[PDB]
């Protein structure tokens, strides 16, 4: 009963993160930020990161959220787009509103670490 397990665990996270990128990469608000990103690497990192954040195993070895988005000067509308695409991804995969809201509430604390950096 971590949020990770409530979402369905490792197989669920492995399905969720590439679907979240399919949506982010179609979203006019954000898709261009990933123009030059190795998407295989990014999907691995973000899988490790959300797995750690939502109380699964902690194997995340990448940058902190300020370092990861340094120099992007990201704006509030970009963060809303990301959270909205993650919520729609979890909804499409059959997660209840309550469990999505629990997830979003944890992720929301990162917003001040990545905006405007
Ligand atoms: C606010 C809008 C966001 C945008 C536009 C964005 C975009 C990006 C981009 C383009 C990179 C790759 C940088 C590179 O290839 O050099 C990246 C790295 C990453 N972002 Fe975001 N991101 C955003 C929000 C988030 C959120 C909400 C999270 C999770 C809470 C997150 C987690 C990560 C992680 C784990 C990395 C990888 C760091 C590493 O490779 O060491 N990002 N982000």
From Swiss-Prot:
PROSITE patterns: GLOBIN_FAM_2. The keyword Heme applies. GO terms for molecular function: heme binding; metal ion binding; oxygen binding; oxygen carrier activity. CDD domains: TrHb (cd14756). Binds 1 heme group per subunit. Keywords: Acetylation, Heme, Iron, Metal-binding, Oxygen transport, Transport. Its cofactor is heme. Heme binds at residue 69. Belongs to the truncated hemoglobin family. Group I subfamily. Monomer. This is Group 1 truncated hemoglobin. The lineage of its organism: Eukaryota, Sar, Alveolata, Ciliophora, Intramacronucleata.
């Amino acid at each position: 009963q971590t949020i990770y397990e409530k979402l369905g665990g490792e197989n669920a996270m492995k399905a969720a993160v590439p679907l979240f990128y399919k949506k982010v990469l179609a979203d006019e608000r954000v898709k261009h930020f990933f123009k030059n990103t190795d998407m295989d690497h990014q999907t691995k990192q973000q899988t490790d990161f959300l797995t750690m954040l939502l109380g699964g195993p902690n194997h995340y070895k990448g940058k902190n959220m300020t370092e990861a988005h340094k120099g992007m000067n990201l704006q509030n509308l970009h963060f809303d787009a990301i959270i909205e695409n993650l919520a729609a991804t979890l909804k499409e995969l059959g997660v209840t509103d309550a469990v999505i809201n629990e997830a979003a509430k944890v992720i929301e604390h990162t917003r001040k670490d990545m905006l405007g950096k």
